[PDB]
């Protein structure tokens, strides 16, 4: 459902947010 391109762009916040 295209729910793959906008997902990775969000995970980039977990890195930074996951510390």
UniProtKB/Swiss-Prot annotation:
Asparagine amide sites (modified residues)? 19
Let me know which tissues express this protein, per UniProt. Expressed by the skin glands.
Kindly list the places in or outside the cell where this protein is found, as annotated in its UniProt entry. Answer: Secreted
Keywords carried by this UniProt record:
Amidation, Amphibian defense peptide, Antibiotic, Antimicrobial, Secreted
GO cellular component term of the entry, any = extracellular region
Any one GO biological process: defense response to bacterium
What function does the entry list?
Answer: Has antibacterial activity against the Gram-positive bacteria S.aureus and E.faecalis and the Gram-negative bacteria E.coli and P.aeruginosa. No hemolytic activity.
Q: Which family is this protein grouped under?
A: Belongs to the frog skin active peptide (FSAP) family. Phylloseptin subfamily.
Q: Under what name is this protein listed?
A: Phylloseptin-H1
List the source organism: Pithecopus hypochondrialis (Orange-legged leaf frog)
């Amino acid at each position: 459902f295209l729910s793959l391109i906008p997902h990775a762009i969000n995970a980039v916040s977990a890195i930074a947010k996951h510390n």
